[model samples]
Target chain A: QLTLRALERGDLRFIHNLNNNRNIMSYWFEEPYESFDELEELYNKHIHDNAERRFVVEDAQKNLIGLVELIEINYIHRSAEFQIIIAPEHQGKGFARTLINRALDYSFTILNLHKIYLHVAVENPKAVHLYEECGFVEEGHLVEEFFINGRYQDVKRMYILQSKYLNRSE
Target chain B: NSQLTLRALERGDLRFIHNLNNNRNIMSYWFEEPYESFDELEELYNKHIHDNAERRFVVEDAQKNLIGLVELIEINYIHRSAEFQIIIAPEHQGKGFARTLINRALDYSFTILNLHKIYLHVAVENPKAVHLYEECGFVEEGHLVEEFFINGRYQDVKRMYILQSKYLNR
Candidate 1:
């Protein structure tokens, strides 16, 4: 089984390597994390930030394969936005699905959140398909919402409610 | 005076805006609850005051009394559009001022700012806001379920938009 847990100091290089991959950053809005110090600063308060959570995704052999983040976690509203990225070599191996399902479980059950949502660039059809397969409904289109890869990109907002997840799980 | 007009935010009106920002009755439809101090608002103003991408206007009536605040935020010049938000003081609710403010805002958006489209996000359950937006020529472009976590629950948001062509038609 895959494991997702808080990112540790030892995992810094792993995260840096995974984050700097051109293939991985293609989906993100900005360039690679910039510097190790920048990432280190984020890691310093990552767990303590009441509104955000950053995780290291590992395989059975304890190989770091990706990163998972829950951003803008609103406690009063019981909801948050989610994001995930997989190492290039780990792509197309069903790791995404497994990781997503686990994340949803943690979101709905552990966090006791009512909903989880995300924004995906329209250019990423594969991700759109994966999110849909995981029960994230396409909610809206934000026109030219993100400036990335030399120009602005339109994004699709998608979400899955706790009720919907429970129904699917049951 | 029934006619509504807009002007730059004045320092004298800051306290009124702060009170309205924290006003529970008016903030129920907003993303956040009451503010703790005027300094927070001053900080916000300082951040946006010098930014050209954000336009915050103070709404005044014929007598020039502050009735509400309207903003055109996240302006994207390349796409020629921006997001819109308006919050009227509780004392000014139930009148036609909201619609008036919206019309004025649209005029400023399309004509003054030369924007192609203006959009907004509102809680789907807010019938008054939904009806008001619909009545003001905004069309429902999409619905995001449980996107905003506030008010002790996850709330669905409706993405409404009005194009320049549509506004011209009206």
Candidate 2:
């Protein structure tokens, strides 16, 4: 089983490891977070700001499994950006599905957000399928939106609505 | 014909900014509602004027009257991108002023700033403005449904972007 909770200072080493592992960091933004101070400042900023939230995924053994975010929330708009990354060890175990459900529950039921949206590289079909399965619908395609690894990459933007998720038959 | 030009917004433009910011029709499309006061506008200017990641300008006619406002915000050096926002007074709109404003802004962003992409989010309900953005070579990248609240209801926003390479005149 898996659960979600707020990240804490104790998890910095875990986060730092996940961030620097090339195999785990391939799909995310360029540049693995290189500094603890930078990460600590980021955590402090997000926790204090109403516009952002971060979650740490914990396994049955209390081991860190992943990270998820509801970022850049427009409180006036009642919306935010959705993102998640399961640890390399946690992959293919159906943990992402549960972790994401927890995120959706928090975002929709607690935060009262009207919608949650995300962007994924077009090269990552697995993530695209996972998002679709999670009730996110494709809404737009951006060409060359990322400048990474010495080249440009395309990305697909997706979103899910609160009403639809709440109304789903499950 | 009017000699249209753009200049850095100054202290003297506060009242003009306040008026535009408070105009019901103008405020409808803005990030805030219920009208902003002169002091609030001055406070906003103080915060904005000193920001290195943003640039705000006043669109002026030959007589140096404030006809509109334009800005390049959220400048990202790593991505070589920035978010665009502009508002033309109702009387000054529909004279192809937005097209001119966007062109001037893009030239400055691309040539002067050496940026790569300029993007913006617009309420999809505003088809006229959507058309204006398209005419400026900004391509629709994503649709965020019911992601914002306006007019006592939720509304969708469209994410659009224009690349320096795809922008013909640039």
Candidate 3:
């Protein structure tokens, strides 16, 4: 079994390791290199920010497996952007879907968000399929949206409404 | 000749922004409530004055009358993208300042800032605004369903974007 918990300062080191992975960061739409100091600084800076929520996914033994972030949470709009990263070693262990479902539950039930949206690189069909399976529908096809690995990459924007999630859960 | 100029927004411009922000008609297009106090605006401005993630500008007429406001916000240098927002005073609506202001902003975004993509969200009901953005080289990217809660109900938004290469090549 897997569990999701609020991200704390202790997880920065694990996140720093993932942040520097080109294969992963490219899909995350971020540069693959960041200093530990910068990550710590950012953690401290946004620890109290209500606009963001960062959670770490762990196995039953409490070993970190991935990170899930609900960033750009707009209370007035009742929407938030979803982002996730599963550590390379933990890939294909069927952890992604569980983490996504948990995150969606927290977003729709706990946070009472109206919408949850995410951006995925167009080339990442596996991830896109996972989101689709989770009830996220394609909202937009953004062309050449991110510059990664020395070239611009297309992206697919997907979203799921609270009504859809709740109905699906029923 | 009705020439328009774009300059960095100043502290004095808050009153003008306040006027626009509080205008129900204007704020509706922005997906925001038309109620913001001067003190609130001042506090926000002071907080973001040194923020590199945002850029605000005011449009002016030949005689120095404030024509509108243009904003390039959520600038992610790593992703080379930003969200674009603009507003022309209701009195200046049909004077053809919007296109000029948008073009200038695009030039700055592409040339000066070297950004890769500029995107915006428009209420799906506002076809006229969508047409204006299309004329400025932005293409429809996605149609977001019930993206914002405006007035009394949820509103749909059309996402549009243009790449720096496309803008420069045109």
Candidate 4:
């Protein structure tokens, strides 16, 4: 009923489709998948990792509706950067907030990181609001941080320290 | 003629002080309750008078109208840090009551009582207070999560500090 784990190999098609949606993909990933092989390579290179970290949210049918991954692992900083993609049809369902809160709990409480940081596309106020509500602050913003859909846009840099989290007792 | 006066909380001082701290919708964010009753007020004043960590003074205008309450609390000489908070009657905001008592508190702490630092936590929601603190030589240190409960919602607290160097620079 809540966020399930993200190890389902069968869910790659759903993830691929969700990633292809212009609204969702435009805010995060910019690359276009021309074929199934391209999607598989992207999944293996970016999603599956030696870190054993990946998450998914699903409905009653157990179809993966959203995906989050801790791709960039910085050991020295005791932190990680996360990338999140939500299914466009699942937008406004409060699922994104629910899933990310769970992911943060896992990262801080279980994974035991001293801090966490993420970037929000400047055009995505909804995600930024959700991050702030979840105790992240706008640490910095980079002008023209990413080129998406043939246009350069800013990215908001946000972070949370261990002192800022309440549920550290995983 | 007295340039400033420190008086006891009179018959209507509590109501005026309550309005000053809370504003209208904003008061619910500042206190555990919307307002305190006469009995509650007496009990609080009794503790404030006796608590070495707390010194509550009611600042008054020449006509004896309620101006504000300037306080020093959480006094720890070993740590050389004390807490400062001020609440001015809203009828007289932007009239320098805050600055007047703020300077008085600084003199008492640094010159008379002798503390190394005086600091306070201001809500990010209140930019006016932040500006006032900066004008008084406090630097923004950091942010805390859910430090103060307001409007049934716990909010972030921004840490600001004024060092002894501030007095030298001033």
Cα-based lDDT for every prediction: 0.83, 0.83, 0.91, 0.67
The predicted structure with the larger DockQ, 1 or 2, is 2
Error of 3 at A121 (Å): 0.7
Better of 3 and 4 by lDDT: 3
Against the true two-chain complex, what DockQ does each candidate achieve? Answer: 0.41, 0.71, 0.84, 0.01
Order the candidate numbers by lDDT, best to worst.
Answer: 3, 2, 1, 4
Cα lDDT of model 1 by residue, B64-170, tens digit = 77898998998987667799999888788887788788988999999899887899989888878898899899887679776676666667789998888789774
TM-score of chain A of 2: 0.93
Q: Interface RMSD in Å per candidate, to 1 decimal?
A: 3.4, 1.4, 1.0, 14.7
Separately for all candidates shown, the number of backbone clashes (residues 3 or more apart, or on different chains) is 1, 0, 0, 1
| Pairs that collide, model 1 | A77-B149
Better of 1 and 3 by TM-score: 3
lDDT of 2 by residue, B1-170 (tens): 33789888899988888888778778767656757878888888887766889888899998777789988998988778898888898888778677888888888898888888999989898898888789878888877667668888988788889988777464
Docking quality category of candidate 3 according to DockQ thresholds:
high
lDDT for residue A10 in candidate 3, whole number 0-100:
89
Ranked by DockQ, the better of candidates 1 and 3 is 3
Write candidate 3's Cα lDDT for A1-170 as tens digits.
89889999889899999999998887788878899999999899997999999999988889999999999999989999999999999999888888899999999999999999999989889889989998899989988888778888889999999998899747
TM-score (C-alpha) between model 2 and the true structure = 0.92
TM-score, cand. 1 vs. native: 0.79
Would candidate 4 be rated incorrect, acceptable, medium or high by CAPRI criteria?
Answer: incorrect
For model 4, the DockQ equals 0.01
lDDT of 4 at B13: 63
Candidate 2 C-alpha lDDT tens digits along A105-165: 9999999988888888898899999989988888888777778777778888888889888
TM-score of each: 0.79, 0.92, 0.95, 0.46
